[PDB]
Design a protein around this nucleic acid. Structure first.
Ligand SMILES: Nc1ncnc2c1ncn2[C@@H]1O[C@H](COP(=O)(O)OP(=O)(O)O)[C@@H](O)[C@H]1O
Lengths: 107, 86, 95, 496, 93, 98, 87, 107, 93
DNA sequence: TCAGGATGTATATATCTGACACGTGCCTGGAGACTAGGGAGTAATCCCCTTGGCGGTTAAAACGCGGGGGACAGCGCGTACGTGCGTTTAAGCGGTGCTAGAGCTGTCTACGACCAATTGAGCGGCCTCGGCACCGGGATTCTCGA
DNA sequence: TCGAGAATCCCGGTGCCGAGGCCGCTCAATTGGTCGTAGACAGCTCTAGCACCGCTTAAACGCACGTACGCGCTGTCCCCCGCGTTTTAACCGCCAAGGGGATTACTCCCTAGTCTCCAGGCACGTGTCAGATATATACATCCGAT
């Protein structure tokens, strides 16, 4: 019997034993299933990969390799659905994306 | 553990600071009565979030308002802040 | 000299592009300690508590001024007043 | 209050002693042991005219129930004069017994004008209203005139009596005469709940036919005749075991030849006769076209279809009738008036054949259906064959219902067919000028078909009447038809 | 002294999305706080979704309905797809 | 001449009559058909308990009343008395909805 | 021919012009423009669409086929519009 | 050896046993205290009595003896701190408390 | 068929505040839903407040802090007074 | 319409610094093996929702019209923020103690969990009688004119 | 500048149906008694917060212009209000089926515990290159006129 982790059985990068322990000891329900920590691991994979992919594009746009919280700010509030999810949270050291009202600037 | 009781307390939030803070918002032509009003509404906000943060501090029987107490005060206040643990 | 209205748009383009923390740290320190003296006496603070509290209040007030700018341009002007900065936080659900 | 209760119980037991079967085995056993130890065949001319000898036969049955102080049911056939027998009984309490009121009759709204014509046509000395009008005008018809007590007979509707239950509790009634009484076939209807809240001396009842579906309907008609006798729901169904549906030994129905006869008087067509001609009826078992054979599988076996399956017996009823009611079986826009429309309904294929055989004979037909949307298909098909017609239906009008009948009963009317629905137009209309009448589908009420069959088969009919029922082979309708066939021998073999 | 921080998993996902892009520590802290926030939302909603049905255990269908109910619109469909793909690969092997 | 009122008297009298009242205000059967039409899209052939339709109607009624009250504040900020589409969309641009 | 159901005034138009008129009178507004009506039908359709999507999610989880009142209460509570009276 | 309800040891009306069972079975924490249900029952006593006393005065205003959802609406939202608690909750059959803007009524 | 409710207790509190005023049925349902709401807010807040200190049980100090934190201003003072009065009278017996 | 400064953008040498990797200890994830409960899944009972039609009643809705008060461009004018420039001044960085208290371990009990008897409060079912809704009618009162 | 006239509130009367009472039962509270084990308190350590002080220089402030935007005022249409008259759709009743959602109730399999080894990842030291200042090259854009 050689121990094989079940982050590898489902083929994920996020841990499944950690999210299972944390979901148990955070007294959500009285019993947990077997498929629930695998399912949560998968959706956290998808969300992290999606927001980080948009931040990577926005970092490469300003000719920078290493990413900044400003780039996370632009990738969050420059999309639409991911803006709708995180619409109420602020972000540290993020700033505001540029817009000026239309009838304010001269013509 | 000393006290250098210095006057002119709240309006150390100066008007060039508040005017920069409005230029980031996208405004163009600020009146002269914005200033005392904005100091008032900032004090209202800061009152509420510090009241809740010091309640969370006092509950765990400590003397230091930590960062996590302020994150929790903002969390239940309505507006979450990422960046400072938790 | 410049025409009145050019330097203002240059400052808009400058302060919306940067991300630095915008009101000065030591008067904000004294404001927080002055306003928290009332609830409990003689507390401590971390540095990151004051930084978190400053960054939150700054983002709050920036979003308030953006909404006030919309509420000012609605009355066909370009000048914000007390009237619309209290209309905005009436209509937000705060007053 | 027990003065007539003695006269009622003793007149129950004045006949064959099957009444003792439940009265002994029932407060209503108290007065039993107190008592257990113990004409006019001249056509009387107080009416303005004559009385037929069979009409005299019915009127004498009414004063039979009157003197013995019990109620009844007058369930004869229309055209025989149920109204004239009713009016002459009222003049018996004006020219013989001379009891000047009060009187309350209730009828459907479509017949109310025909009553007060018929009152003064035979007893002109009667003071009677027709209570019409709105919330303004009914106040003068109550406060100024009904409260003035200057009346004999009040003629209301089924639905004004619901709005006006409060000013009619003030008057204690000598009679309540309910006409066309299929409304009280339910015991839990809103109208029947209002009726028991009144006060009466006598309670008459005139309907066309008794029960249509269950035995449970008929006793509720008799419960609001004389509630002192039954007042019971368990004790009538379980004593009779629901229409002898288990053995058909037909010896429990001998009891119906003992119970119903002190309260019922139903007479046959063979009296005069009315149409002076017997009629026939055929069943035309037709198949299904290949398109609607798919849609029968598109619903059950869940196969283009995209159908909602809410009411099973109603969605499949459209499939058995005509495929193009499902609005997706139609070919797409632009919509073509074409012969592939009739190709996918096997009934229309026969109907195309059937109208050709009768165009030569000139037999003008009346067509019924349970759905107005399927008349809309025949609305266009008669144009596509260039056939003149008219369409009386629900939601047309009331004034439109006068004219198009007078078109079709006009001499030398060039209208080939004439369209109607079943439960809509049974309002005493005359369509005897048509000779044949066909249907389109079955119905859960066999008497709703059967009352509709006498649309042309009444007084004034001179030609032979044929009924053709379009029945779909091995489908939903052959279940519904046999269930409708089952209920028809029921009230036939009870009465006849 | 022991502190669990989600950091290395975020770095692995970064190294298989953009194989050459790095991340500063402030951004790593901010995304740590992001996954804790989203995790607590989905788990806290699935808990009360299981409480409404008088059911004691929390299961895969609860997380299914919570992640369908919670994160908006078009973003829910791909998340459901990733979740079902992972669960079927887990039970099959 | 017959007796008319000035333009605006009937309006204030209506405002008093409906703020004093507590009845349910948009009708029932058209709202029934709207809920069935709006939820046919999400899944076919559902059924509705009638108390659910009453709950949904009361919630939308309360929401839409509060929206018109906010729109009236914004219109009276613009130094008018008529409400427009401009402020009925400002009053929920400023809310967090658009 | 006219044998089809295509000729019908559609279903959001059941919210009549005097109904929104009364509904704004309760809100306390004196004079109403003519372009409120279509935009208000748009706003109501948006609001009901979100709430009824959440309600059908809560039903379809529990393997029913009928929406209850507690369902609508849970949807409105989750969205932040908590409704007392039916819980 | 004869029972006494611990709703009566505190001198309350709200049931301490019921709120203890409900706070246990509603899986809030893994262990529950002894004074916690008593404290909750007391604060529910006070809040219910407060909203209902204002409701009783508002019902007595309109010459009524029985209270209505209209009276609870006028009890909540004409108050200040209780309005601050119940700001986000609508009430069935409530209606709006009367107000007309001041520069809208004629003069 | 068995359903539990805070009905009779609200009626008792009504009759020891107003000796003659009655309550209707709709208002009884609305106040039953009210006390369910306030109970769920306070207990759910004390849950996460006890979680923030790595402390397993929930005790009277947690309800103390949560009612101080959740309901505003001058109302918290009287609620704290009522709660401590009940706890002292409970532990005295 | 074209020259004139003061702005924003490649542009290349040139430091600090903090992210990325490498290498070590130890904490929990898991394999597994037995048990027990929870929830699935058939299987009766009954009662509120659904379709496609009839009938009648009756307030709402739809439409139309005259007209009047509001929205809305122009237009003048008068303060009042914007811009810039000297002149203070206090924030910011950079050291340097100094100690309050955050945090961690060690015992060791008070106190919730858990269990089985036991038995009184609360929940469905019944009746029943005033509180409220409604209807003329009457007095008052608010809005429209001289 | 006070009369006409319609709207609203305040008086009686009926009547009806839901809120308050009582009755029976039954099943969750309540008592009494073990029993493990969170948290309470005491004690030690070391770390991050607090108070200083000095030096430099961005930054605030107070002054002067000066033009441009806010605001009152003026006609001028013109769109929404108020009332009168058709017209139609809600709103009840009714038909006639049927069907999905709640209660026992019973028997598998899923998950939680429990002991046991090993490896994952977290902290802690080294030891390098992307970002930033800086800083002098050339670079694109509003501003009196014409
Ligand atoms: N002896 C008679 N002579 C002439 N007409 C008669 C006679 N008896 C009955 N009628 C006719 O019969 C009609 C009564 O119709 P009736 O069958 O009572 O209708 P329904 O069945 O709808 O009550 C009357 O209009 C009357 O003219």
């Amino acid at each position: 019997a050689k121990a094989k982790t079940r982050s590898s059985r489902a083929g994920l990068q996020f841990p499944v034993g950690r999210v299972h322990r944390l979901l148990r000891k955070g007294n959500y329900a009285e019993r947990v299933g077997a498929g629930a920590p695998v399912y949560l691991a998968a959706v956290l994979e998808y969300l992290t990969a999606e927001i980080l992919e948009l931040a990577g594009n926005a970092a490469r746009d300003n000719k920078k390799t290493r990413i900044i919280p400003r780039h996370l700010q632009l990738a969050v509030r420059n999309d639409e659905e991911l803006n709708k999810l995180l619409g109420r949270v602020t972000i540290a050291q993020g700033g505001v994306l540029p817009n000026i009202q239309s009838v304010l600037l001269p013509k | 553990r000393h006290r250098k009781v210095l006057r002119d307390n709240i309006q150390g939030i100066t008007k060039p600071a508040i005017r920069r803070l409005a230029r980031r918002g996208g405004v163009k032509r600020i009146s002269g009565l914005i200033y005392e009003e904005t100091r008032g509404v900032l004090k209202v906000f800061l009152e509420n979030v510090i009241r809740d943060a010091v309640t969370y501090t006092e509950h765990a029987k400590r003397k230091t308002v930590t960062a996590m107490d302020v994150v929790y005060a903002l969390k239940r206040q309505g507006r979450t802040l990422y960046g400072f643990g938790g | 000299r410049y025409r009145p209205g050019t330097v203002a748009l240059r400052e808009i383009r400058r302060y919306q592009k940067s991300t630095e923390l915008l009101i000065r740290k030591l008067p904000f320190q004294r404001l927080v300690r002055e306003i928290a003296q009332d609830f409990k006496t003689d507390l401590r603070f971390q540095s990151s508590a004051v930084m978190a509290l400053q960054e939150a209040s700054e983002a709050y007030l920036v979003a308030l001024f953006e909404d006030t700018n919309l509420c000012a341009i609605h009355a066909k002007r370009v000048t914000i007043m007390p009237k619309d900065i209290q209309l905005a936080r009436r209509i937000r659900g705060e007053r | 209050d027990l003065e007539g209760t003695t006269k009622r119980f003793e007149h129950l037991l004045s006949l064959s002693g099957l009444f003792k079967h439940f009265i002994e085995s029932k407060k209503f056993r108290q007065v039993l042991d107190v008592l257990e130890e113990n004409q006019f065949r001249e056509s009387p001319a107080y009416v303005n005219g004559q009385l037929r000898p069979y009409q005299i036969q019915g009127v004498n049955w009414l004063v039979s129930l009157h003197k013995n102080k019990i109620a009844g049911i007058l369930a004869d056939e229309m055209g025989l004069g149920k109204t004239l027998q009713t009016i002459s009984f009222l003049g018996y309490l004006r020219y013989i017994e001379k009891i000047p009121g009060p009187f309350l009759v209730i009828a459907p709204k479509s017949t109310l004008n025909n009553w007060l014509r018929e009152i003064n046509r035979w007893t002109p000395d009667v003071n009677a209203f027709i209570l019409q009008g709105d919330k303004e005008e009914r106040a003068e018809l109550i406060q100024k005139k009904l409260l003035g007590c200057d009346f004999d007979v009040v003629i209301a509707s089924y639905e004004i009596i619901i709005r006006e239950k409060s000013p009619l509790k003030k008057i204690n009634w000598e009679y309540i005469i309910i006409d066309e009484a299929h409304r009280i076939k339910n015991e839990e209807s809103m109208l029947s709940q209002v009726l028991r809240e009144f006060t009466s001396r006598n309670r008459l009842l005139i309907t066309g036919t008794p029960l249509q579906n269950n035995l449970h309907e008929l006793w509720a008609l008799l419960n609001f005749l004389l509630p002192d006798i039954f007042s019971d729901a368990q004790d009538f169904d379980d004593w009779f075991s629901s229409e002898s549906t288990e053995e058909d030994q037909d010896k429990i129905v001998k009891q119906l030849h003992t119970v119903l006869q002190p309260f019922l008087l139903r007479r046959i067509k063979s009296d005069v006769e009315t149409s002076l001609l017997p009629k026939k009826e055929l069943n035309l078992y037709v198949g299904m076209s290949s398109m609607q054979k798919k849609w029968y599988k598109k619903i059950l076996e869940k196969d283009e279809s995209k159908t909602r399956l809410l009411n099973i017996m109603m969605q499949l009823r459209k499939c058995c009738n005509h495929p193009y009611l499902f609005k997706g079986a139609e070919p797409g826009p632009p919509y073509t008036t074409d012969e592939h429309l009739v190709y996918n309904a096997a009934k229309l294929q026969v109907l195309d054949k059937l109208l050709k055989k009768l165009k030569e004979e000139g037999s003008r037909v009346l067509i019924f259906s349970q759905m107005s949307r399927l008349l809309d298909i025949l609305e266009d098909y008669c144009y596509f064959r260039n056939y003149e017609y008219c369409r009386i239906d629900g939601s047309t009008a009331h004034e439109d219902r006068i004219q198009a009948i007078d078109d079709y009963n006009a001499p030398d009317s060039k209208k080939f067919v004439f369209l109607l629905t079943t439960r809509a137009g049974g309002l005493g209309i005359n369509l005897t000028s048509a000779d044949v009448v066909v249907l389109y589908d079955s119905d859960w009420n066999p008497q709703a078909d059967l009352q509709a069959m006498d649309r042309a088969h009444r007084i004034g009919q001179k030609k032979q009447v044929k009924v053709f029922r379009l029945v779909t082979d091995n489908s939903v309708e052959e279940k519904i038809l046999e269930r409708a066939t089952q209920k028809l021998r029921l009230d036939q073999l009870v009465i006849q | 002294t022991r502190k669990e921080s989600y950091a290395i998993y975020v770095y692995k996902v970064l190294k298989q999305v953009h194989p050459d892009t790095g991340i500063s520590s402030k951004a790593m802290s901010i995304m740590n706080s992001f996954v804790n926030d989203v995790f607590e939302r989905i788990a806290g909603e699935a808990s009360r979704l299981a409480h409404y049905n008088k059911r004691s255990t929390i299961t895969s269908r609860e997380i299914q309905t919570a992640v369908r109910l919670l994160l908006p619109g078009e973003l829910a469909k791909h998340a459901v797809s990733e979740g079902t793909k992972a669960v079927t690969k887990y039970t099959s092997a």
